[PDB]
Each structure stands twice: as structure tokens, then as C-alpha cells.
Design an enzyme around this catalytic site. Structure first.
Site, PDB file in Angstrom:
ATOM      1  CG  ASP A 280      -1.658   1.240   1.481  1.00  0.00           C
ATOM      2  OD1 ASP A 280      -2.456   1.630   0.587  1.00  0.00           O
ATOM      3  OD2 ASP A 280      -1.435   1.858   2.553  1.00  0.00           O
TER       4      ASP A 280
ATOM      5  CG  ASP B 255      -1.650   7.337   0.333  1.00  0.00           C
ATOM      6  OD1 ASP B 255      -0.687   8.110   0.139  1.00  0.00           O
ATOM      7  OD2 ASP B 255      -2.486   7.040  -0.547  1.00  0.00           O
TER       8      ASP B 255
END
Ligand SMILES: [Mg+2]
Ligand SMILES: [Mg+2]
Ligand SMILES: [Mg+2]
Ligand SMILES: [Mg+2]
Lengths: 211, 211, 211, 211
Positions: D43, D45
Site C-alpha cells: 500500500d 499511504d
């Protein structure tokens, strides 16, 4: 350096506390009950704003391999005129500023940032922290000069009685003028490293003040 | 040795976690869901009983200046025949034992205490932990012999599949026979020092297991 | 309301600090620099002695289904005349008593334990804490029975300037007479539950004082 | 219900640990010993970038009174084409990416950010994390819009064996396709609140991964 794959721990270590005078905003406010309006002051970077985004950008842009950007006028002009749009206000600061406005205190910001031709930092702070005109004062850009605490004379001149900050020089500036220096924790994702030893002067440290 | 009057701290240190596989009693029970009855085992001292009171008394009485009391038959006769009236059961053990009784598991206690002519420790454990006759087994007094793990052969002989203990030898005894060794934290007021490094073999460590 | 099998955590919680005025023995000593010899006092149970072994034995023996053992003279006679041989001295107390003896301070113990015909607790304390004759004072049994004086009254009478204790009543007794009440942590394996909230009156709490 | 001025604490609370499967980067690396090169995913963020500076600016600029900025193409165009210059790379990600590159693993980034006409995030990531051309892959924008595939589908498609992420959905995406989901802590100064409960599915959580 390498370290054990499975270091383990023990309950003495898990429970261990450094002898630090932790305080809450509520405790600070209570300690001031009945005190009439006075001047108080805040450091900016890592005290009221998580401003690493701009400092990180500045370093990458102007001196990827050194700290020279911090003496670069071109950097300061960027930092003080819009890069704080990316600076994340700290909740501890919202709470302290609200408390000091409640009290009718005059609020000063005293920063080691270098002065620039124009600055929008004062507006950013007034806006983000909802500081009324009467409590607000233009940011004091005290600069940074090795061998001198550039903030101490400002705290004296403005008769600042409590000074909040994350760095050792913030606390010792308060000490220099006989003000009450109170420590805010610098966030562990700050780009300004190493993290200071909060509480190293026996000063009050605000709990949970890293955000 | 001397250390700074005001050492301070920082939020990296305050948040810092050792890479340990912490588990709860509920997690252990869930990991065993559907498994039919089996044998499990417990160390006694600092695992199910805070027995420092008796060991402390023993040291003061029999060898105030050394560890010789631990090889003294006169000490063991006292320790195993009533001094456990002062031993404080651990809540983690109440919870584990209840859980294993729920499962229909056979419960063994394997201790490095020396064997004596008579012992009342088995009764103390059955009584304090409300262990039914069918789940209870007489305490195995495996003794302590430097250079050998006296518990490993017992875990094998009794086909013990999970062994709970506070000391490194408890975990490695489990490892020796391919059992699941699970660590309980030794209380910081135990007289048995230094505290072990719980988790140093990558084993599961039960949270909050110091009481 | 659910106690989830896998509750997880987050870094706000991991770094979270209660607003406690933590202090060290060294900091307390520093605060006393240049002060002439004076009287100081200690609570006994969970302050200088982990005496839960005797209290645990007392409850099981004399009132397994209630707290009535604490009103039973038969229990107190055992507790005050030898069961402290099984009590575990606290390291924090060793450090404090050593520090105060070095200052030439008078050492008082003021306890809420019920008084007995004879007591050997004073000797246990002098022996374990190596308290010289000139600094040692017989244990004071304080309370609300006829002919007794309260902890507060005794602190006043003996001009005790600092009082160390684990319970709320130890701190309030000190404060009622203008003495400095300093809190020691009760160990989590104490049988005296619930644990107090150390720091509940904004008093100093000694770091790592559970052992 | 009261939030007392002086709440105090106790040593059970101080030593309390959540039952979390904590791991280190070294432990993860060890678990992969001898495994041939493979695809792994991150991922973006709060996993590899503290991108709150841009998201904070986006909210203030485009929807100060709501969350509508996250549906605003004008925001995404700014966020994906340069505002990551103000995002702060996470040290945990530097360590993981370095470790995986050393293994010869393929590095994928799979994000729920809305897609844009152009994006410079891939370059930001390759530059900051020193990801060699042979290990680098363009950012994958996953989601539920027409013509998109979900995170799960992309993990399946790219044969991603381990997926690192801070949110619940990162872990469940991995688990839905039989991949190893490993949790990174979201920093407490992130503007994406509330913080997730890292470890909520019994997954591995990387120690000290908030920075
Ligand atoms: Mg600062
Ligand atoms: Mg043991
Ligand atoms: Mg007490
Ligand atoms: Mg994320």
C-alpha cells in the site's frame, strides 16, 4: 548494526518509567486559575505545526546532501510564503491555544526560522488555530545563530511567562529569562533528527503531545 | 552506577516495541478449538505460584550469603511441606488451568524443585486452582542439575504437548521434545533474578502474565 | 462491549502517557540538598514490604470466604510476630532508607496494621534495611481504635516531613499536616486490590517502585 | 465518566500489553531464507509515504467542511502529480524495500488513490526508495470504478505473495487471495482518522513502523 533475531523482554522493562514530570493541558490550565491575562509563547516547528513536509521538500530541492538549505534565502522564501499549506497542525497546540485564548492571554510565536521579505506563516497560524485579532501577534522570526539562543531576548522583550517548544533551546530560552518552559514531544516521523530528550532539564512535558 | 538527574525521553522510545509474539489465554484456547484432550504441563515457581516468599525465607534461614540453600535437603523439606501456604497463585495460571480443565486436558506440573520424602505441593495446587481429580497429576519434582535439562525427558514420557513456564529452560524443554513452549512473565518483585528475556526463542509470551 | 479475540492496537495508545509527576530517588535526594537531619516516615505494606504472602495465608487460614481475617486478633498475632519473614523487601525502600540514613534522618514506620501484644516487625525492618540504631524507631501502630492516634496525628507528633506510601490515605495523611506525601507503586501481584491510582492527588510518584 | 485532573495510574496498566503478533523486518527476512525471487506489494499511504501533508492541503483547499475532496478529480490531479514531494518516506518502508530488493523480489505498489490522466508517484517512489529499474513496477491504481480491478484481483494477477499495509482492507485483500498480509502502524499525526487497530485479524504487525 545487527541485533538478536529474538531479543525478548521482561516485566521490569515493560513497566519502566523515566522520571519525567508529565502534565496535561487541563493541569496547566488549573495551575493558572485566577491568573490575569499575560503573554505566552510558542515555538512553531514540531510544537504547533508538523512542518517537516516543507523542510523535507526544501532539503531535497536545495541541498540533498547537506543542511545548507537552512542557510539558503531561496529556501526560506518558499518555506515562509506557502509551504506551510502542507504543515499539519498539532492537536496539542489547538488545545493549548484555545486554553490561552480562554484566559485572555496574548499569544506569541517565536521561531528560529530565518526572516524573509514577506511571510504568510502568521496568517496560517491565526486561521488554523482560530486565534482572534486581539490575542494574535505577528510571528517573530528570530533566526538561528550557533553560540547564541536567539529566542531568549524575545521572550524577555515580550515579557513571555510560559514558552512551549519541542527543542532543548526552547526550554533553555525560557530558563534564561525565568519563564516556565514546557516541552512538547517532537513526532517520530519528523525529519528533524535526532529527537530531543524531552524532560532533560526537569521541565514539564505535555502528555501525548506528538500529535 | 550514577546516571543523569533528568534523563528525559522521546516518543520513539515511548512507543518502542520489542518484536515479541504476545498472546492471550483466549487466543491460545481458540488455537486449540476442536483438539481432543491431551496432556499439558506447567512449571510451578513464577509460572503458577509466586513462591519467592518461601525461597526468600529459605535463603535467609539456610544460606544468607549464597545459593547453597537450593542444594540443602533441610530447605526442600520446608519448601515442599508447607511454605507454599505463603505462595500467591497467579491469575494467568487460574485462567490457563480453567481453560485446560474445560478442554478435558490432563494437567502436569514439572518443577526443578528437588524431591522430598513427602510433599504437600500437589494438594496446594489442586486446592488453589480447583483442579478435578481426573485432570490432576502428582507434581513431578525433576530437580536441577547443571548441564542437563531435567524436564525434557518428563515432557516426553508424559507426552506433554504444551508447556508453560517463566524460565528459558522451560521453553527449551518444550523445544527439546517438539512441544509448544509458552512463556509466562516472571514478576519484577520475584527474588529469582535476573528476570529472563521472555520471547528470546521466538516463543509465544502471554500478555499481563506477571500476576 | 466485545473483548475481541484480536483486539489490535495503535501508536497513539502505545505512546500514551498518564499525566503523572514521576520522580526518582536521586531527584528526591537532590531536592533535600543542604537540609539538616529530619524525621521521615514510611507506610509498611506494599511500600517497604511486599507482605501479601502473610496476608494471603491469613485470608485462606482465617476467613477464606471474607475479609474478616483483618479484624481477627489471631491473624494479627501471626502477622506481626513472624509472618513478615516471608515478606519481600522492596528495592525502592532499600534505596530510600539508605539515602535517608546517609542524610542522618530519623526513620519512622507508621502502619494501619492492628496492634498486638508483641511485635517483631520493627526488628524485621531494621535487620532487612540495615537501619542503624540511631536512625531506627519502633513501628507506630496508627488508627481509629480507642487510645490510638491517626496516621496524621503521628506524623504531626513525630514532625515527619516526608511520608512514603502506596495508598491514597498515606498521601492524604501527609497533606493534612503539611508533610510531603510521596507515592510508591503497589505491585500488581499484591493481594490488596484494586490497585490504587498512584498520582491521584497530583503527588510525586517514584518510578519503578513496584519492586 | 469524569476525566479527573489527576487520573493517576497503576503498574498493571503500565505493564499492560495488547496480544499482538509483533515482528521485525529481520524476522520477516529470516522467514524468507532460501525462497526464490517473488512479487511483493505495498500500500502507499501511511505504509511507505506519510502523505497526510498533501491530503491535509487537499481537504483545506477543496473541501474544508467535508470529505468531498477525495471524490474531486482536481484534488487527485494535484496529489498524484507532485504533492508527494511533500510526503515523508517511512523508515520501515526503506528497510523492507531494501530487504526485498536484496532478495531480487519484484516491488509492486497497489493503491486505492483515484487514478489520474498522468501520475508521478511511481517516480517519487523509485527515487526515494532507490528502487532499481529491474525491481520497480508502475503504481497500480485499484478500486471499484468501471474498468478497474480490486486490490485482491491485482494481488492475484501479479502473484503478490506478501502485502504490506496500514488499513484493515490491505490485510483482508491479502488474505482473500491467500497472500501474507503484514500490518504497518499508521502514524498518530496522520490526518486519516481514526487509527486502525493494527493486529485486528491476528496478522503480523511490524514493530516501530509508525516512522
Ligand atoms: Mg521546534
Ligand atoms: Mg519457574
Ligand atoms: Mg501500604
Ligand atoms: Mg494506507
Amino acid at each position: 548494526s545487527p541485533s538478536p533475531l529474538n531479543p525478548g523482554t521482561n516485566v521490569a522493562r515493560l513497566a519502566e518509567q523515566a522520571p519525567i514530570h508529565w502534565v496535561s493541558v487541563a493541569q496547566i490550565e488549573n495551575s493558572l486559575a485566577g491568573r490575569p491575562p499575560m503573554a505566552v509563547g510558542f515555538d512553531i516547528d514540531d510544537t504547533v505545526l508538523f512542518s517537516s513536509p516543507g523542510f523535507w521538500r526544501g532539503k531535497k530541492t536545495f541541498s540533498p546532501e547537506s543542511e545548507d538549505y537552512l542557510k539558503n534565502p531561496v529556501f526560506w522564501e518558499k518555506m515562509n510564503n506557502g509551504w506551510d499549506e502542507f504543515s499539519i497542525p498539532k492537536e496539542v497546540a489547538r488545545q493549548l491555544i484555545d486554553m490561552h485564548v480562554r484566559r485572555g492571554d496574548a499569544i506569541f510565536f517565536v521561531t528560529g526560522r530565518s526572516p524573509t521579505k514577506t511571510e504568510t506563516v502568521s496568517k496560517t497560524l491565526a486561521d488554523n488555530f482560530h486565534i482572534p485579532a486581539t490575542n494574535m501577534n505577528p510571528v517573530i522570526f528570530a533566526g538561528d545563530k550557533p553560540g547564541q539562543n536567539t529566542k531568549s531576548q524575545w521572550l524577555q522583550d515580550k515579557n513571555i511567562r510560559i514558552f512551549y517548544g519541542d527543542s532543548d533551546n526552547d526550554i533553555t530560552a525560557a530558563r534564561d529569562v525565568g519563564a516556565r518552559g514546557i516541552r512538547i514531544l517532537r513526532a517520530s516521523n519528523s525529519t528533524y533528527k535526532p529527537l530531543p530528550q524531552a524532560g532533560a532539564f526537569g521541565e514539564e512535558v505535555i502528555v501525548n503531545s506528538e500529535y
